[PDB]
């Protein structure tokens, strides 16, 4: 596979997102790391899909809403940042105030 250090680390974000998604699906309000994991994995998968940085800055604000998360979680998350390989190489996406 030739995994580099970042590829190994970033597998763990996907895993944490899968965990959080299962928790959401059984009806739980999500906590801080769960919310961050879901949005982060969404960005990374979006890059893989070939979306632009600008599309993901927009979409990342609609992945989770306040009713999906515990009290205070929206205000704990000022932004979520992720780097991923786009069709045009690694780029940084920052989603500002992802959950209103």
């Amino acid at each position: 596979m030739h995994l580099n250090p970042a590829e190994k680390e970033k597998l763990q974000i996907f895993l944490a997102s899968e965990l959080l998604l299962r928790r959401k699906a059984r009806g739980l309000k999500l906590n801080y790391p769960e919310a961050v994991a879901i949005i982060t994995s969404f960005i990374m998968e979006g890059a893989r899909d070939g979306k632009t940085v600008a599309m993901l800055m927009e979409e990342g604000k609609h992945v989770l809403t306040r009713d999906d998360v515990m009290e205070g979680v929206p205000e704990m998350i000022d932004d979520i940042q992720a780097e991923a390989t786009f069709p045009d190489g690694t780029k940084l996406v920052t989603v500002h105030n992802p959950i209103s």
Binding site: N4, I13, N31, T40, G72, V73, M76, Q81, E83, L92
Partner: protein
């Protein structure tokens, strides 16, 4: 020109009279005073103040009042106060708390806090800064426990063990000269301060003392090695000669004596009573009465902290598992019921709040959680505020008194108890620069950066392959202070005076900073900061009810805690 307070706090962190919520608790701390000169705040970045000829002095060499490191705009939470200041570090030590920058052009600059060519900058605006936690009940069982401790703001581990040997799995003991030597050498690779306890057992002095001379920093008396009157006595006679502390886990079984017999053996000498509530060990059911005595330095371990709805079920079973007890053997059930008591655990919450139990600790990996000493301290304070109200001593509607009482339990008090408070345990000039930065939203839960001897050792930081350090995954990671030979200069091995005088560090090739244990035998309860109360604690032998000043101490267990499911992935 004036700035409103909201905007001021956003830019520089809070100032006098402003309050900050601790994580998701109901506890608020208030800035008591501020060392700054408004308008001359230090800060670092593009077009900011700490630039050459401006807030950075361009003239002075490092020796000439210049700092190695300035933490700008810190909100300090410490037994000494809750206040706003810059913190200056040099040669690995805190050398100034005050106002940093350049006397060329700024008013109010503390004279030895010059930002110069030699100065690194950490921005502490909007952070709470505390001393590194001092955990005095550590079993050295699994090296992976060190990062667990660092991640929750612990910087000193005092205890014993050789790894997952049964003696060590039960007791904070590194026994005998050879095991001590081996563990001092192992310590060279642990990125945290360390002090090692020998076995406080024997009926002759020499077998006990040779451990001190070998490099132990103290002793541990534990019932699993025979917490007899003789072992108690000999250990304290050694400790008095050697100027080290003795920790005790007493005879739960009351086999050779009841509490009064253990106190008679102690004979007024200073001792650190571990897990004084007793679920963690000690004379059943009344060990916690130790915490009323003037010669006793009393700590709790953490799984009883605070009293919750799952506590009893969890502990009763934890005890059965660990002792291989059987549910159908009445002696085993009776033993467990005599040891795990809601009456004493509920009173333990209150005794903390009253300043009668002076210290927290973990019992890491034996009956306690390496990364939850700080966590559970604050959860306890929060529960007590909810159930008992703001303390009478509070002013305004701040929780400053309670915050100073509780921060003392895991910083300065354990340091004083172990004879190491000259080096560590508080944010004071002249002490080692072990500092923990916290985002208020994560306060007490997950440390932002842990500074050891003036260099960051551990940090919550992100993708090492990214353009900047904040992208995911943000996780706790060892930093440059832990790498290469820098691990030697950023950490302290605490040792007895006799081992130091006898040249043990050179004999063993120890490269770490060597700390001297001292002034352990001339202290008492009165020396426990904000937690100095002596009183007669009565524990009813039949009902286990606890009374102080004729009043039953009871409170309810809570179903929910802050600093819990909002934060943790598991």
């Amino acid at each position: 020109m004036k700035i409103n307070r909201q905007q001021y706090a956003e830019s520089y962190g809070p100032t006098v009279g402003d309050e900050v919520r601790l994580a998701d608790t109901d506890l608020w701390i208030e800035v008591e005073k501020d060392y700054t000169t408004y308008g001359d705040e230090v800060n670092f970045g593009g077009g900011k103040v700490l630039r050459e000829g401006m807030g950075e002095n361009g003239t002075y060499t490092r020796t000439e009042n210049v700092l190695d490191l300035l933490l700008t705009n810190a909100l300090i939470l410490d037994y000494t106060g809750i206040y706003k200041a810059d913190i200056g570090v040099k040669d690995g030590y805190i050398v100034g708390i005050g106002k940093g920058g350049n006397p060329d052009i700024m008013d109010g600059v503390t004279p030895n806090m010059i930002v110069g060519t030699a100065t690194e900058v950490i921005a502490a605006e909007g952070k709470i800064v505390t001393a590194g936690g001092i955990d005095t009940h550590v079993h050295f069982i699994n090296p992976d426990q060190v990062d667990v401790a660092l991640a929750n703001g612990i910087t000193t581990l005092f205890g014993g063990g050789t790894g997952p040997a049964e003696g060590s799995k039960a007791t904070t003991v590194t026994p005998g000269p050879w095991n001590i030597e081996k563990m001092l050498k192992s310590t060279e690779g642990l990125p945290i301060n360390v002090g090692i306890l020998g076995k406080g057992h024997g009926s002759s002095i020499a077998p006990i003392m040779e451990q001190i001379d070998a490099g132990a920093a103290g002793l541990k008396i534990h019932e699993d090695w025979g917490a007899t009157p003789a072992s108690i006595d000999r250990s304290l006679t050694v400790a008095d000669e050697a100027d080290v502390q003795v920790a005790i886990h007493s005879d739960t079984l009351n086999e050779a004596g009841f509490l009064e017999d253990t106190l008679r053996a102690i004979n007024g000498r200073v001792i650190h009573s571990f897990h004084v509530e007793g679920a963690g060990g000690g004379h059943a059911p009344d060990i916690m009465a130790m915490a009323g005595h003037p010669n006793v330095l009393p700590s709790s371990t953490n799984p009883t902290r605070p009293f919750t709805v799952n506590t009893i079920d969890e502990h009763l079973d934890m005890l059965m598992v660990c002792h291989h007890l059987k549910q159908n053997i009445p002696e085993d059930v009776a033993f467990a019921d005599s040891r795990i008591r809601p009456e004493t655990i509920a009173a333990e919450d209150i005794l903390h709040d009253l300043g009668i139990i002076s210290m927290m600790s973990t019992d890491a990996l034996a009956m306690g959680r390496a990364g939850e000493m700080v966590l559970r301290t604050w959860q306890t304070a929060d529960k007590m505020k909810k159930q008992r109200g703001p303390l009478a001593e509070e002013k305004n509607g701040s929780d400053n008194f309670r915050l100073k009482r509780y921060v003392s339990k895991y910083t300065i008090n354990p340091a004083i108890a172990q004879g190491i408070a000259h080096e560590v345990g508080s944010i004071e000039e002249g002490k080692f620069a072990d500092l923990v930065l916290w985002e208020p939203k994560f306060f007490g839960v997950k440390a932002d950066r842990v500074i050891k001897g003036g260099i960051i050792a551990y940090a919550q930081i992100g993708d090492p392959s990214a353009s900047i350090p904040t992208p995911q995954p943000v996780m706790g990671r060892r930093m440059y202070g832990t790498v290469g030979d820098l691990i030697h200069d950023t950490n302290i091995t605490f040792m007895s005076k006799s081992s130091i005088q006898q040249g043990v560090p050179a004999k063993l090739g120890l490269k770490r900073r060597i700390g001297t244990v001292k002034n352990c035998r001339n202290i008492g309860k009165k020396d426990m900061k904000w937690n100095d109360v002596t009183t007669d604690i009565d524990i009813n032998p039949e009902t286990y009810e606890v009374k102080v000043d004729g009043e039953v101490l009871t409170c309810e267990p809570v179903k929910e805690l802050p600093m819990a499911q909002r934060y943790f992935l598991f």
